[PDB]
Subunit: 131 residues, 4 copies
C-alpha cells in the first residue's frame, strides 16, 4: 500500500513546487502554489501519499514560519485536494493538536503573534477536517 517507485519519482520532479510553497521563511506562499499543490494531490494516490509525508515532515522540522505555511496548505487541500489525500490526512491527524500547542519565548518585536497564528491555523484545520 506504500507508494510505487514510479510515484516516488514523479513526486521528486514536483519538489521545486513544494520547496517554494513551504519555504521556512516569513514570505507568504503565493496563491498559484496552493493550486499547484492541490494538483499534485490529484495526480495519483501514491502522489498524495508522498505529499502527506512531505508536508508532515516540513511541519515537524520547520520554525513557526514553515509550520504556518504547511497548515495553510493543508486547509486549502481540505477544499480542493483529492478524496484519497483527505482520507489519509484524517487517518494521520494526531499532529493537529500538537500544532495547536505550538509555543515558545516571545519575540521582542512581534510578541507571541507567530505562535498564535500557527495555533489558530491548526484550530481552523481541525475544525474543517474534523467536522
Amino acid at each position: 500500500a506504500a507508494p510505487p517507485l514510479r510515484d516516488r519519482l514523479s513526486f521528486l520532479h514536483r519538489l521545486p513546487i513544494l520547496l517554494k510553497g513551504t519555504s521556512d521563511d516569513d514570505v507568504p506562499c503565493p496563491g498559484y502554489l496552493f493550486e499547484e499543490i492541490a494538483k499534485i494531490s490529484h495526480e495519483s494516490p501514491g502522489s498524495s501519499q508522498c505529499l502527506l509525508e512531505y508536508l508532515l515532515s516540513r511541519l515537524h522540522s520547520s520554525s513557526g514560519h514553515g509550520k504556518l505555511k504547511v497548515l495553510k496548505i493543508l486547509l486549502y487541500l481540505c477544499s480542493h485536494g483529492s478524496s484519497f489525500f483527505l482520507l489519509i490526512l484524517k487517518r494521520n491527524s494526531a499532529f493537529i493538536q500538537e500544532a495547536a500547542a505550538f509555543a515558545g519565548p516571545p519575540d521582542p518585536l512581534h510578541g507571541n503573534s507567530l505562535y498564535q497564528k500557527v495555533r489558530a491555523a491548526a484550530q481552523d484545520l481541525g475544525s474543517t477536517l474534523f467536522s
Copy 2:
C-alpha cells in the same frame, strides 16, 4: 481503537486549558486547571487518549519547568482522573523511569533543584501509579 475525529475536535477546543496548565515556565499551575484537566479525562475515552498524547508530548519537549508541571498533573489524575485514562497511562508508563533520570548542568543560582524536583515528582508518580 484510536480516537474518533469528533473526540479529536472536542479536545482541540480544550487546548486553551492545557496550554496554560502545562506552560513551559516557572509559574506554578493553578489549582483550577488541575480540576479542569481531570474533567477533560472524564469527557470520553477518546478525550483521555488525546489527553495522554498531549501530556506525554509536553513531557518530552519541555524544559524541566514544563516536565514538572506534567508530572504533577499526572499525579493528580491518579486520584481524580477517569478509570480509562489511568489504564492507558499504566500501559504507557515506560516514560516514568526516563523522567526519573532527568539531569543536566547545575544552575549557578538554583543548583540542581529543578532536576531534583522533576525526579522526585516522577518517583512519586511511579509510587502512586505502580502500587
Copy 3:
C-alpha cells in the same frame, strides 16, 4: 530476517572504511572508498543490511557535507552494489524526497551551493534508483 550477529561483527570490523568515507566534512570521499563500500555490500545480505542502516543513519545525523557524501555513495552502489542491497534500498527509499528537500540559511561565502548539491544528488539518486 534481521542480520545475524556474525554479520554485525564483520561489519563492525569494516567501520574504519565507512567512517572515512562518510566523514562529516568538506573533504571529498576518495575513489577507493567507494570501491571498498561496494565490496562491503557484496560480503553478505546481512552486511548489506548493516550498511543500509549505517548510511541512512549518517544521512539523518550529518550536516550537508556528510549528507552529500552518503548520497554519492548510494548513487555509486546503484551501479556496483549487490542486488540485495539495492532491493532493501528500494524498500526503504522514502528518505530520498526528504534529502531532496534539504535547505537552510545561506552561507555568506558559498550561498546555497551546499543545499543545492545535496538536493541535486538526491534527485540523481531518485532518477537512478526509481527508473
Copy 4:
C-alpha cells in the same frame, strides 16, 4: 512480555545507583556501581528489561562521557549480568555500530581522544557480545 508494573516500581527505586553510574561527566564510574548494576540485572527479567531501556536511553542522549560509561557498563554485564539481560541485549544490538561511529569536532585540548575511546569501547562490546 513488557515488564510488569511491580518491576517498573522496583527499578525506580534503583535509579540512584544508575544515575550515579551513568552520569554524563568525566568522572569515571566507580567499581562498586558496576557490581550494583549487574545485581540489578539479576533481580528479575522485568528488571533487566527496564535496565536495558535505561542504558540505551542514556547511550542515545548523553555526550561522549556518558556514552563511554554506558558502553563500559554493558561490557561488564557481558561477563556478570544475567542470561536474560544478555539475550535481550543481543536482540537489540543494532546500536553498537552506531556507537562505533561516534565522531565530532576535535577538542583543542584533548583532540579526538573521547570519540576514539567511545568507538573503541563499542568495538570491544561488539567483539565480546557477538563472538
